[PDB]
Amino acid sequence: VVILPEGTQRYVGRDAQRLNILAARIIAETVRTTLGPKGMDKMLVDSLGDIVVTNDGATILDKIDLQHPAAKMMVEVAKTQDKEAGDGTTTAVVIAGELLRKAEELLDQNIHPSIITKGYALAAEKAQEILDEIAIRVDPDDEETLLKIAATSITGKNAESHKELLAKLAVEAVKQVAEKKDGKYVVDLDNIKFEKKAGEGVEESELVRGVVIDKEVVHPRMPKRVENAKIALINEALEVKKTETDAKINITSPDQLMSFLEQEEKMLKDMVDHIAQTGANVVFVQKGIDDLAQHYLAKYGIMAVRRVKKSDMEKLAKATGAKIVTNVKDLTPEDLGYAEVVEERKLAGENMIFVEGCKNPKAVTILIRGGTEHVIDEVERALEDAVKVVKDVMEDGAVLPAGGAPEIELAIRLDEYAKQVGGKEALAIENFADALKIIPKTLAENAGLDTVEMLVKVISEHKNRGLGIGIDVFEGKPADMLEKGIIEPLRVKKQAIKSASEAAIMILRIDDVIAAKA
Amino acid sequence: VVILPEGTQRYVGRDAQRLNILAARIIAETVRTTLGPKGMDKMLVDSLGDIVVTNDGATILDKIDLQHPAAKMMVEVAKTQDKEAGDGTTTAVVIAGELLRKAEELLDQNIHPSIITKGYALAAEKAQEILDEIAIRVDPDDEETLLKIAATSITGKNAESHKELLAKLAVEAVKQVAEKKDGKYVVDLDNIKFEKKAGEGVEESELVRGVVIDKEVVHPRMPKRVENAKIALINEALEVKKTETDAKINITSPDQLMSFLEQEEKMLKDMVDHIAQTGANVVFVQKGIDDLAQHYLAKYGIMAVRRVKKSDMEKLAKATGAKIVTNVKDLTPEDLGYAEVVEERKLAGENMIFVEGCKNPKAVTILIRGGTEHVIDEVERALEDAVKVVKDVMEDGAVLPAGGAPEIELAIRLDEYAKQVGGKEALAIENFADALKIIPKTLAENAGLDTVEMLVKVISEHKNRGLGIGIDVFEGKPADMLEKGIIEPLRVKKQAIKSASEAAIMILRIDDVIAAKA
Amino acid sequence: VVILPEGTQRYVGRDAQRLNILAARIIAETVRTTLGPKGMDKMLVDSLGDIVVTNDGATILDKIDLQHPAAKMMVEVAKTQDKEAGDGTTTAVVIAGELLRKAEELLDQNIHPSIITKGYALAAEKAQEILDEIAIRVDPDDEETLLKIAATSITGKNAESHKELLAKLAVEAVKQVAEKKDGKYVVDLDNIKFEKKAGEGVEESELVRGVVIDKEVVHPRMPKRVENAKIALINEALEVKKTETDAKINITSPDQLMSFLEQEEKMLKDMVDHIAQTGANVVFVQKGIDDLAQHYLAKYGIMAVRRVKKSDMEKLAKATGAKIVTNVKDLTPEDLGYAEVVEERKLAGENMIFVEGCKNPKAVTILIRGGTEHVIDEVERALEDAVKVVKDVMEDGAVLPAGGAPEIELAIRLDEYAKQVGGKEALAIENFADALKIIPKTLAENAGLDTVEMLVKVISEHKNRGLGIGIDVFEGKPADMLEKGIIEPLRVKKQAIKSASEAAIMILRIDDVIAAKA
């Protein structure tokens, strides 16, 4: 009997399983080649011909147009990993793939899915306990650590050539923006601007203790540089105000034509006059500025920029100290901000306003320079992770070695744990532990090393020497990640195992796939 | 003669019956593999490409694009179960499938349909008396019982890995929200919000004795945290009011251009002033909030949120005690609510507002966290069922054992009831009793146990040890369900038989199908 | 640069392997469900609506229209197995598939395929030795064991309902036509004919110590039954002969039109007359028989058949003892054969000739009766196997237990062998040993038993009691196969392993698939 529409496709039991797992395995196999300091990049071109060159796992999975649903779910793993911890996106997708691969060996041995699923949930929970335990508690503020986290992050990415600098710029920015409260920090990444402009070299990028607005000084007669600038922030358009209630002038005598043109003229002037009287010499207006207004600002020697982005008004406020005022009328000197220098400056041709030298900015800007548009785009991404990863540490105060060290310890510990629980769940558990080895395994692989030999060396060397033993892909030998300074946030590995696990266990429970026709 | 339009399909008698019962049987066979704590899930992809991975029967049947009308009939059963009792969607459809299957054996024996129908109705009514009679009455808020109900509900779903936590949250939320009238409890599930947000793990989900609104503080200079918050709830927009009747300002002198602007200016300000005067320091406005208003509101150090959903306004009142006022002017201190803490906060990046720590909230929020969108989506569903099962018991005050125990009880007795009425109705009644065993049969079937033997052992032991005996899928052995806490609501089983029966009878009365071309 | 033609497909490395192996495994999982006493059958309908219902692995794979190259390669395994041992066609394919599954696990470890390949060959050669050792030697003609071989061969098929009768016929037939040159037996399965005729049940099937031919007695006045028949076997047609060299009669007088006519008559009469003179009373002619000749044979009371099939002439000779002569002229008494009864009978309404009661028939016929044509076709296949496995044991005094006992013995021993080889080959040898368990595994699987549990009991017991311990699917537990009388030829296992092994190694060696557009 015709129950489902002609065109609907369906797979049940093992077919549903074989398919779903394979799609996931293939996606993981697609991004794993990107993982690690010797991992390479992918060039992606969408339907419109837009080109994206990047090493980022999340970006890749996001830009690429996947079909198979199982493959789409893996994307969720990378996306969530990215929002919560920054780095580790390729790691989570890769681990998720391997977990499934190891589960199908069991699935094939006829272990009921519920058992595998239960075993994994146990291993996953136990992996978090171990991580919280073997993590290196650190000084949320320690610059030396924040720098290694940043530098380690900016590795195996196009921008690695200038990681010392970029790391430095990334740590400084987060430190400044970071808000202290209860010996515990909180970082709002919106207080860090990323302004990019091709030209020069990446080595020319910098941190501006203030804001870099891609705007211009409205009037040519205004000053292009103001030293000890008193900044005023208004978001009310400098123009002739009209009531909300409909209203219309009723001219009855010829003299009114003038009296009303002048009244509007006076209103416009009084606004500018009011501004001047606060002693402000620089004004940023979120909205428009009539020509007459601009003219008086110019005659006052007041520099002015109009139609400034809402988010840009906020950064200026936090950097300069200035307080945004809705109406010019309410502007007082106590609302002006400070900046050592504010000036129009041309970058790769285009003019831009620089508000720098702010006392203690609560918002900062990283100016990214580079040889081509594509270059500065992939630097901005590298920098985005660096910032988030630095953030993770200042907020968590916990760090771990990299090089596969965590995944290796976990694989040793979780396996021993398996023996403790026994039964068929112990099979799922030891399989979970096994799957974790793709991280160290993939690192050596991408480095063109003999996968089998390396694992043998690190595991044993790690078992002997300790928690920090991981793979130094550059030197192609086991090494102490801690001494090498190869370090990452605890959160990266925590979120990575959480998302991958939950995703795997969800996919692993699907024994019936029913897709309609598109 | 050409009576019907070309393309019209028609089936009569055995044909009409054979196809109708087949589609239903198949729809039942499709969701049965989802039944029980060992049941699996289905991934459903629609014509747009949106993915739905779940275990819930109603969701499945609802999301799938069914063609055959008899199949569409079954969708009604699962749906009604879901609204009325929450859990039990799949079993209702399964029983309905089985009932029709056993009925056809009688049709084939040439028993007139009206007799089979009569037997089923007799059997179904008798089943309700039996269910009401063996039902285990317990007291409405017995936390221990409620926790077993929620835990039993959560098992067999993706979330089961964390059922202890989720059960606890479900129960707490319902106990708090529940209202008692005349020694009777009534629960409006609208006083329980579910907020989702990927990141962390399902293990991080919590119960907020207050409200989590997905919005942010409208003004940057407003506080982001208010401790002993005095909350004001207003829905009228904080903007310049206009009459319902049309009006237009008729300007006649220049001095007016200013006088009217300042009047609107004053109106805006007066509102904010009035709010401040009540003592309020946190205000949720349902409509919009003018820049000028936000500016004054800010200067007062009052946190404010614009465009808050009406449903969220209602639960903020229920929770904080605040009273929703329409016009700012009518706001009073007695209209203000309380919250131990109200603060903006970022979750996986996106900002949010927490109104936590209310005295005796009447509405609460279960904040769900998870590794991926799909995971929190399924968790939400599980939480939904859990909550409704807990509601069933607080309102009904009756519970039954699970594991196919009730069905085995029903099967025994109903079969004995048959012997009583005798005749041909007796055949229909004894078949209804037989049909009821798919539940225990399917539990064993999805667990990989020998259906025939398990069925023999339960019915046997059940007859010796009574009501409590059902199947323990996790131990592949019969067991006292009451002892193991494997318990479920009386409503779940009652509503199941009701909908399963009426549907089966309706289909069974059909001896002519007439379908027009689409 | 365009090297290959558009439409050409190519896969390389892991892709070529993934594809090839997945293909092989799928084709193996497909025929897998027919293995063992509780293996089921498949109905194959080709493009011409022709229907085939078997349990035979070789028949299935040969009839299915396979697209994938890898799949096509498994067919050769099934086919070569059938030609050499009869049974084990499915086993060979199932093992080959598992062998590849276990090998990709090593491929994923990045174990060079050269190593996996070398290891598998060691395991295979070792397996042959082990088989030759554990092989139980018996008397090639020992009826007792011969019947056990046949009876186990037949079980698990449609004709098992009558495995006693059928085995008796098979063992009897092969024994009779079997030739013992020098203390060594050799058997030509061509001396055993299979005749099918729908009608009655499979129980009426029988062994004719002679030949059954689907022909009729050429002339009506000829005897339909001849008691102690003196059979004559003529090859040339009984017609007016003609020279090889072109020739024509040149008539010159009326008297010749008649003399040449009477001469051709005389020629026909002499032939028949001559035959008659030998004393022959039954005559099978391979070619035609002129109407005049028929008339004479009739007068002489000689029963004759014309147009007898060549292969039947040879069976008639081998059975009756008659010597086949080319020209009637050379036929003599010493050439006549003997049959205790040559008679015409109707079967399913069709006339057939029965030559039975032969002295020491060297060619024999098994007459197959059945309920339908399909039933009869499947019994014929069931018999073709019984006949061949019996043949195996008469030429090889070797026999082995079944129920997966051999594969279990091999898995245990080959695992030990691995240890003394060590290194990565050890891994490969272990996987080859592991792979061998799908036999016992799927035997239990098809019986509905628990694979994991069974495997543990069998191996445990086998280790305790010895070589004969295997799975008794009918009783659902381990048992002694030798006592139970469940034995198979040594050949079945030896060939299976070879074919499976050589094919697996061949596929593992591929790393580049290049397919032209069809």
CA-closest candidate to residue A156, choices A57, A52, A38:
A38
A115 to chain C, any CB pair closer than 8 A? The answer is no
Number of cross-chain residue pairs from A and C with Cβ atoms under 8 Å apart:
19
Q: Which domain holds residue A105?
A: 1-138+398-518
- Pick the residue from chain B with its C-alpha nearest to A501: B371
d(Cα B403, Cα A40) in Å, to the nearest integer?
54
Residues B68 and B124 occupy one common structural domain: yes
Q: What is the CATH number of the domain that holds C352?
A: 3.50.7.10
Count of the separate structural domains present in chain A: 3
Output the 3-class SS for A273-304: HHHHHCCCCEEEECCCECHHHHHHHHHCCCEE
Q: Do C445 and A110 touch (CB under 8 A)?
A: yes
Residue B103 makes CB contacts below 8 A (sequence gap 6+) with B21, B116, B120, B428, B431, B504, B508
Contact between B135 and B399 (Cβ < 8 Å): yes
Contact between C366 and C193 (Cβ < 8 Å): yes
Set of chain C residues whose Cβ sits within 8 Å of the Cβ of A110: 445, 450-452
- The first and second tokens of residue C209, run together, are 């110590």
Contact between A238 and A264 (Cβ < 8 Å): no
B518 to chain A, any CB pair closer than 8 A? The answer is no
- The first and second tokens of residue A162, run together, are 């200038």
Q: What are phi and psi of A289, to 5 degrees?
A: -140, 105
Interface test with A, best of B18, B38, B43 (most A CBs within 10 A): B43
- The first and second tokens of residue C238, run together, are 């009984």
d(Cα B485, Cα A337) in Å, to the nearest integer?
66
Q: Do C101 and A109 touch (CB under 8 A)?
A: no
Place of tokens 């011969």: C146
Set of chain A residues whose Cβ sits within 8 Å of the Cβ of B476: none
Q: What are phi and psi of B193, to 5 degrees?
A: -90, 150
Rounded to the nearest angstrom, the minimum Cα separation between A118 and chain B is 7
- The first and second tokens of residue A432, run together, are 């979970």
Contacting subunits of B (3+ beta carbon pairs below 8 A): A
Burial C270-284 (b: 16+ CB within 10 A, else e): ebbebbbebebbbbb
Q: Is A396 helix (H, G, I), strand (E, B) or coil?
A: helix
Q: Do A424 and C452 touch (CB under 8 A)?
A: yes
Set of chain A residues whose Cβ sits within 8 Å of the Cβ of B252: 249-250, 252
| Helix (H) / strand (E) containing B413 | helix B405-421
Residues 264-293 on B with a CB inside 8 Å of A are 264-265, 291-292
Interface test with B, best of A114, A309, A384, A432 (most B CBs within 10 A): A114
d(Cα C411, Cα C429) in Å, to the nearest integer?
10
d(Cα B172, Cα B207) in Å, to the nearest integer?
8
Q: Do C451 and A109 touch (CB under 8 A)?
A: yes
User: Which among B42, B239, B247 has CB closest to A512?
Assistant: B42
A117 to chain B, any CB pair closer than 8 A? The answer is yes
At which of C374, C397, C420 does a domain end? C397
d(Cα C512, Cα C509) in Å, to the nearest integer?
9
B374 to chain A, any CB pair closer than 8 A? The answer is yes
Burial C490-504 (b: 16+ CB within 10 A, else e): bbbbbbbbbbbbbbb
Please report the resolution in angstroms.
2.9
| Helix (H) / strand (E) containing B398 | strand B398-401
Set of chain B residues whose Cβ sits within 8 Å of the Cβ of A235: 291
Residues A422 and A351 occupy one common structural domain: no
User: Which among A105, A110, A450 has CB closest to C451?
Assistant: A110
C-alpha distances out from residue C302 to A82, A184, B328, C310, Å: 99, 118, 127, 21
User: Which among C105, C111, C450 has CB closest to A452?
Assistant: C111
Strands A229-234 and A337-339: antiparallel
Four-point Cα dihedral B109, B114, B120, B126, nearest 10: -130
| Experimental approach taken | X-ray
Residue C416 makes CB contacts below 8 A (sequence gap 6+) with none
d(Cα B499, Cα B497) in Å, to the nearest integer?
6
Residues C434 and C493 occupy one common structural domain: yes
- Pick the residue from chain A with its C-alpha nearest to B267: A244
Set of chain B residues whose Cβ sits within 8 Å of the Cβ of A509: 40-41, 55, 158
d(Cα C88, Cα C95) in Å, to the nearest integer?
10
Contact between A152 and A487 (Cβ < 8 Å): yes
Residue C514 makes CB contacts below 8 A (sequence gap 6+) with C4, C8, C9, C10
Output the 3-class SS for A422-476: CCCHHHHHHHHHHHCCHHHHHHHHHCCCCHHHHHHHHHHHHHHHCCCEEEECCCC
Residues A224 and A353 occupy one common structural domain: yes
d(Cα A193, Cα A116) in Å, to the nearest integer?
46
Residues of C designated catalytic: 56, 89-90, 385
Residues B241 and B340 occupy one common structural domain: yes
Can you list the alpha helix ranges (DSSP code H) found in C250-302?
Answer: 254-278, 291-299
CB atoms near residue A310 (< 10 Å)? 10
Q: Which sign, positive or negative, has the C-alpha torsion B82, B84, B88, B90?
A: negative
- The first and second tokens of residue A341, run together, are 């220098």
A9 to chain C, any CB pair closer than 8 A? The answer is no
Q: What is the CATH number of the domain that holds A162?
A: 3.30.260.10
A324 to chain B, any CB pair closer than 8 A? The answer is yes
Residue C204 makes CB contacts below 8 A (sequence gap 6+) with C369
Q: Do B41 and A516 touch (CB under 8 A)?
A: no
- The first and second tokens of residue C98, run together, are 């598992």
CA-closest candidate to residue B153, choices B140, B170, B138:
B170
Contact between B219 and B371 (Cβ < 8 Å): no
- The first and second tokens of residue B462, run together, are 């059940």
Residues C343 and C438 occupy one common structural domain: no
A90 carries an active-site annotation: yes
| End-to-end Cα distance, chain B | 23
Residues 185-204 on A with a CB inside 8 Å of B are 188
A105 to chain C, any CB pair closer than 8 A? The answer is yes
C-alpha distances out from residue C270 to A362, C218, C235, C267, C273, Å: 129, 19, 17, 5, 5
Q: Is C480 helix (H, G, I), strand (E, B) or coil?
A: strand
List the helix and strand counts (H, then E) for chain B.
16, 23
At which of A307, A341, A361 does a domain end? A361
d(Cα C406, Cα C399) in Å, to the nearest integer?
11
At which of C397, C416, C445 does a domain end? C397
Q: Which of A30, A56, A415, A434 is catalytic?
A: A56
Q: Do C111 and A445 touch (CB under 8 A)?
A: no
Q: Is C479 helix (H, G, I), strand (E, B) or coil?
A: strand
d(Cα C352, Cα C213) in Å, to the nearest integer?
6
Residues A238 and A172 occupy one common structural domain: no
Amino acid identity of residue B173, one-letter, is: A
Residue C255 makes CB contacts below 8 A (sequence gap 6+) with none
A422 to chain C, any CB pair closer than 8 A? The answer is no
Q: Is B279 exposed, middle or buried (0-12, 13-18, 19+ CB in 10 A)?
A: exposed
CB atoms near residue A237 (< 10 Å)? 18
Q: What is the CATH number of the domain that holds C73?
A: 1.10.560.10
Q: Do C110 and A450 touch (CB under 8 A)?
A: yes
B302 torsion bin: left (phi>0), alpha (psi -120 to 50), beta (else): beta
- Pick the residue from chain B with its C-alpha nearest to A114: B38
Residues C425 and C384 occupy one common structural domain: no
Q: Do A502 and B370 touch (CB under 8 A)?
A: yes
Q: Do A518 and B65 touch (CB under 8 A)?
A: no
A385 carries an active-site annotation: yes
Would you list the DSSP string of C221-248?
TS-SEETT-EEEEE-S-BS----SS---
Residues 493-512 on B with a CB inside 8 Å of A are none
Q: Do B199 and A495 touch (CB under 8 A)?
A: yes
User: Which among B22, B33, B42 has CB closest to A514?
Assistant: B42
Residues C214 and C356 occupy one common structural domain: yes
d(Cα A386, Cα A389) in Å, to the nearest integer?
5
d(Cα B100, Cα B20) in Å, to the nearest integer?
9
Rounded to the nearest angstrom, the minimum Cα separation between C109 and chain A is 7
User: Which among C109, C110, C452 has CB closest to A109?
Assistant: C452
Q: Residues B307, B366, A492, CA angle at the centre, nearest 5°? A: 95
Rounded to the nearest angstrom, the minimum Cα separation between A5 and chain B is 6
Q: What are phi and psi of C87, to 5 degrees?
A: -85, 165
A148 torsion bin: left (phi>0), alpha (psi -120 to 50), beta (else): alpha
Q: What are phi and psi of A339, to 5 degrees?
A: -155, 135
Interface test with A, best of C29, C106, C109 (most A CBs within 10 A): C109
d(Cα A33, Cα A41) in Å, to the nearest integer?
8
C111 to chain A, any CB pair closer than 8 A? The answer is yes
d(Cα A82, Cα A57) in Å, to the nearest integer?
9
Residues B118 and B163 occupy one common structural domain: no
A235 to chain B, any CB pair closer than 8 A? The answer is yes
d(Cα B96, Cα B438) in Å, to the nearest integer?
10
Q: Which of A34, A54, A80, A89 is catalytic?
A: A89
Q: Do C105 and A110 touch (CB under 8 A)?
A: no
* CA B10 from centroid of its chain's CA atoms: 38
Set of chain B residues whose Cβ sits within 8 Å of the Cβ of A501: 201, 371
Residues C31 and C144 occupy one common structural domain: no
Residues B94 and B168 occupy one common structural domain: no
Set of chain B residues whose Cβ sits within 8 Å of the Cβ of A125: 161, 203
In chain A, what's the furthest Cα-to-Cα distance? 100
Q: Which sign, positive or negative, has the C-alpha torsion A384, A390, A391, A393?
A: positive
User: Which among B199, B250, B291 has CB closest to A83?
Assistant: B199
